Design a protein around this ligand. Structure first.
Ligand SMILES: Cc1ncc(COP(=O)(O)O)c(C/N=C2\CONC2=O)c1O
Ligand SMILES: Cc1ncc(COP(=O)(O)O)c(C/N=C2\CONC2=O)c1O
Ligand SMILES: Cc1ncc(COP(=O)(O)O)c(C/N=C2\CONC2=O)c1O
Ligand SMILES: Cc1ncc(COP(=O)(O)O)c(C/N=C2\CONC2=O)c1O
Ligand SMILES: [Cl-]
Ligand SMILES: [Cl-]
Ligand SMILES: [Cl-]
Ligand SMILES: [Cl-]
Lengths: 396, 396, 396, 396
């Protein structure tokens, strides 16, 4: 009779949700409201004081959104959740809540581009300095820490080449120096990786990806201790970012997350097959996938992740032009940014996202002329493999 | 054949919208998507470069949200719009885009509470200092400006007692000293006040209030010059706040804004009647409404606003206890925070929102024991007056 | 404290709705669910028996939809409401619930086309015969009644030329002969006409038109005595048509109906102005509008309707080709079927809806070569008049 | 590049859908509109004539709904689809389109209750007679056919005890006598059974169940030859039932159906495990599940179905009272009607749905005092088994 005691699939379906109390409606009602009516002046005061429970206004909280926040707290084994307008807003609400002028952050370099831009260009303009390191080398993390360091920030697997970061080891290091460890768990979902269980303090997601799963919501979520989440809600979100989630967005995300287990199983079963295919193809120079035993951090990945994920990166023979030929030749895979949708998505950062950026920053950045990123969907993998095989044969 | 040439009611209905190009659908389609598919690698690069038009990903922009942004730009007579997750996020995305460590803001004191909290407690922690003044006295604004001042920030009418700020005069002052003027136009909507036409640089709204009008969306909008709005989108929103609007939220706001003209007319017709009623009631000590000729800035209000608004504040005889008795005695008016809904809403900040705050800060704050705020809805005003009359008679 | 006692505007806003009981949410929650969970086997039996209140399954009923049904019952001064998938489904659920093989219906001829097709071609194939008459001549109604007659069916105003039907007189006639009177009140809404108050037994609407008002819902509603509505729900809808409304559709319709009063006022103020304009134009041969004193049933219209409506029909000089030229020349008015949207809509049945139909059936049907139907929106009427003036000048 | 050529999982994801043509939006836009605007009078006529393609009005058709209709046509290997307001409306729109006064239907007895009520009580009142038979005995079907017989109507598996009907054999029989075969495929979905491939003429579903899968849509779909579907759309739906689907409902159903393959796999894997558990339990007298080899039509089920389904019926020792004790004792399984949701649902028709019905009709009806129906969800099956084990132990 407590959400937290059942099996993980049962939790994915039930945690945070129950039949509507007034009607018995099974689906979580969409509470698409701005405000909430009090029974009396007294009831109203009690709430605002934070001296009693219940709702006030949707920017502060909402019943639909609370369900999503509780569910994801359960799935990550955290105390509390807070939904946001976007994955970016989960990351910024978190870091702007934690940090102030004079503070320092140690961040992985191999992170999502927009996260990198916030940390590189915006944070320092608020007097918050960021040191970037290769987080696959925990010694670089240690060496960059300063007395001012409040936060160590990592993604794993990391967005270009799916390199990994040893969460338990990094956590120990951050904590030794009095810092918090923030892990962006977007690529894996709680079904595949649980950073809190390994020592992380706070997990953030873009729910836009696998947690929603259906390519129709932009949203984020933050999971952590109740004392942190309260500050993130009542200061970060309320005052600083304003990044509240729409109740309709939460409702969809709750709907999408119901099938998280079965989606992740299929995404990962499909991706392993595709990755093996790509590894045997004479036109493919490299394949980056945690499920291939040639992955340089293969055994860490086996300890830390329950499945190897739905994302594959790979380099095609012939560099830029061949990568451009390849992505213009797929008929099933869809050319787009984003990942974790039911559809297979493909992007060639060098001819697409990074064409005006110099060959030199790209390489610094882990991005070679022939690098393709593939988000594996729920189609028949034979169809995806055939589409790839055809596109690759043409391109090379 | 250009949105901007028609009458204001026609603009409210049509500006920013047209039949769907592929199907002829009259209602703006809800583009409830995360991502967008490119025809080719080439098409994709062109977009990311910002070297061609079209969509990429919903955090950056979306067709439904663009319609709302264009409509509101038209209505405010601004170049460009940007929708946000909330009114707060409109204000913060704006100010965090404009300001960096070492900068200064001159703000009105008589502003929305959560705005006040951001400026008082959060901004300074990013090295951005804020000086608060009585903005009804334009000399206080001038006296507080510093070489570091980037922004002057005002609301008009202002949220407790509906005091006004001379937008044209303040604009002239801010500009003389090289600062921008930001006006929060939430209380009035563009139907009743147009700050850009009076010299303001940027307008922000909580669309949660009268622009949406239906009490079912939390959202914000920012209107200004294209060069500012681009930075607000591609830095502020993309990187810093993450405060993007859901396409469903935009769709509803577009739907709600269709009736803006007719709603504002009725809200204001209703409020004037209620305000006159309250002014003749021997149990009511004061009535704050711009449409009453005893308003201390009555003639400014006549120059600057086309209608006197839908919000009334008033003090009931007997202070705190009588205000508490009064709001517990209404049967039609609903006790809640927020404003600009089709329903009449009432709040007694001293027994509700501000009961744990000391009698002394409250007065500083413009908030007396008997102060009630009333958001006039679209009901029959005789019904609202009778509900008030009954509640007041009981309370006193 | 009873919905039914307040003023009509107050009823439009509040009737059928209240704050959510479990949370205080002001907006009616969207109960977008299929089923409802019982506390026990006992609770479940009680409900199915129809021996206790509460929900079972959304085809039978739903909390969101119930709010809409109660509101519209209040507005029409009927006992009970039942929402449907469409206006057609309101009409068919009603008539298929009432009638069986061997029964007879007396219908107006001047009715909506799809209604006409159901009565002309489908009803008789179920052994239910229909006699069509000119319902503007109550003697034709009397003369067509038979011992088998269960129902007299009318629209007023009627869809081509806005001819009227004397509801009170027809009701008296139908009742004298033991039949029920069904009135389709779509064109007027309850704000402008109340057929139950004049003696009708059952009212039906396409809520797609003015009750929703926003051009984004297909739906219907039926209002009548509880004993009829129960049969319409538990037989007609449950078993025969299956025509249940989506809870999201109901939610939108509830949202749209909030502004019914202010929309109808503006639609009718706009239409009267446009109609006067069209009556003075030398290129316009006829104008059909109840608000023009030359309307042949002008004084009936003054007794029966509170406003003259938002729909205008008119004939342009030069017949078919000029009507085609005219509708291809409007730049603001939108060419489409449907009516009662915030946008101005125009249709030229002879070149559009009825081009393959012979000049001869069209005339029978009330439809002349130059007949244009105009649904007046909420734009500035000067803009609509200018668009019309321009299009008419060009066409003639 | 044709939907129909890919693997079944690929079809579930992609069939009927493509990126939005005007924007590239990946998610099918929600075209939540009533009407559609024409470019000219000419364009409008062309469409109405049925002499050109494109949209007119949402009751007739809509882009979102069309996607769903095309997808499901692909999945069932039929020519065309038509979405409806409910499963009931799919069945009635179909049969009322096909049949007229004097016609005859041969129906299975073991069908959904509301279907039974339509055929038993409503059809005959339109002069359409229905003969009910045990459809597990194809000779009873043959013996009941009459020269007037237009339709043979079956469900398989059938709603109480999951008895089967030999679709290929029944099809051959119906066709021999000049009748059409209609199969309600709701229990299986196209992932598990394809009646058209076995000779059925028309398939109907309640999409409320497994096709949507998420317990938040009431809807139906009809699949068949284009010439039948056109009549079902342009007469049945347009004129008779009015049972059109909301575009939002279609959008959700499209969203839900993306995971159909992976959901059905898990539902059926879970159900087989639960069914084996129930078969070994000394307190359970019978277990009705097609996947148990003791099922009396086990081998037919192996030929006709790809998986044995997600529904299990079973009788508990001690009849009525024990069944009532059992369902009041489950803590995880939810007491509700409906099936095919992500949640496990349970119903005890004798103490719930059929408590006021005499012990005698119930038995006629296949319904014993101890009969429980279980809709297996996506939870961990060990959790469901433990909940059952606990509830059963308590009840007996
Ligand atoms: C790891 C990770 N964290 C955070 C975000 C930010 O989330 P949002 O604000 O977009 O919801 C993304 C977005 N990843 C994207 C976004 O577009 N293409 C991608 O690979 C991401 O991949
Ligand atoms: C003038 C004004 N600006 C901005 C906001 C912030 O907008 P949001 O983020 O809530 O959309 C509010 C909210 N006013 C509220 C909020 O709750 N009660 C009120 O009077 C406001 O009144
Ligand atoms: C008077 C009236 N009754 C019933 C209906 C049927 O409603 P629905 O099923 O479409 O919601 C319409 C539709 N009138 C239309 C429909 O398209 N153009 C019109 O003038 C109508 O005008
Ligand atoms: C086989 C089958 N066909 C058609 C329907 C009708 O579909 P609807 O109109 O409800 O979408 C149901 C509903 N089955 C239900 C409905 O409530 N409990 C059940 O087992 C059904 O099980
Ligand atoms: Cl795949
Ligand atoms: Cl009022
Ligand atoms: Cl107009
Ligand atoms: Cl299970």
């Amino acid at each position: 009779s407590d959400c937290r005691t059942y099996g993980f699939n049962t939790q994915i379906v039930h945690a945070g949700q129950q039949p509507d109390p007034s009607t018995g409606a099974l689906s979580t009602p969409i509470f698409q409201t701005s405000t909430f009516v009090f029974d009396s002046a007294e009831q109203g005061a009690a709430r605002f004081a934070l001296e009693e429970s219940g709702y006030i206004y949707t920017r502060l909280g909402n019943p639909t959104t609370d369900a999503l926040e509780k569910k994801l707290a359960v799935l990550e084994r955290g105390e509390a959740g807070l939904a946001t307008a976007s994955g970016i807003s989960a990351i910024t609400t978190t870091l702007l809540t934690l940090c102030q002028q004079g503070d320092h952050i140690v961040s992985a370099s191999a992170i999502y581009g927009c996260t990198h831009a916030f940390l590189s260009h915006s944070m320092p303009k608020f007097g918050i300095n960021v040191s970037f390191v290769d987080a696959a080398k925990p010694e670089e993390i240690r060496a960059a820490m300063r007395p001012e360091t409040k936060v160590v920030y990592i993604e794993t697997p990391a967005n270009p080449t799916l390199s990994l970061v040893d969460i338990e080891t990094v956590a120990g290091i951050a904590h030794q120096q009095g810092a918090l460890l923030v892990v962006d768990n977007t690529f894996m979902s709680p079904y595949c990786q649980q950073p809190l269980q390994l020592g992380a303090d706070i997990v953030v997601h873009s729910v836009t990806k696998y947690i929603n799963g259906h390519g129709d919501v932009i949203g984020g979520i933050i999971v952590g201790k109740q004392e942190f989440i309260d500050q993130a809600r009542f200061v970060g979100l309320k005052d600083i970012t304003g990044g509240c989630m729409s109740p309709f967005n939460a409702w969809l995300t709750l709907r999408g997350v119901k099938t998280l287990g079965i989606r992740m199983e299929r995404h990962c079963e499909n991706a392993l097959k595709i990755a093996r295919f790509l590894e045997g193809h004479p036109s493919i120079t490299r394949v980056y996938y945690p499920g291939l035993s040639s992955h340089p951090q293969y055994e860490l990945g086996q300890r830390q992740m329950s499945l190897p994920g739905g994302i594959i990166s790979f380099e095609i023979a012939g560099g830029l032009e061949a990568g451009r030929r390849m992505i213009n030749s797929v008929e099933l895979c869809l050319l787009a940014v984003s990942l974790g949708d039911t559809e297979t998505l493909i992007q060639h950062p060098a001819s697409m996202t990074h064409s005006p950026v110099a060959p030199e920053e790209r390489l610094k950045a882990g991005i070679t002329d022939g690098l393709i990123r593939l988000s594996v969907g729920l189609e028949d993998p034979e169809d995806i493999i055939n589409d790839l095989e055809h596109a690759i044969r043409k391109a090379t």
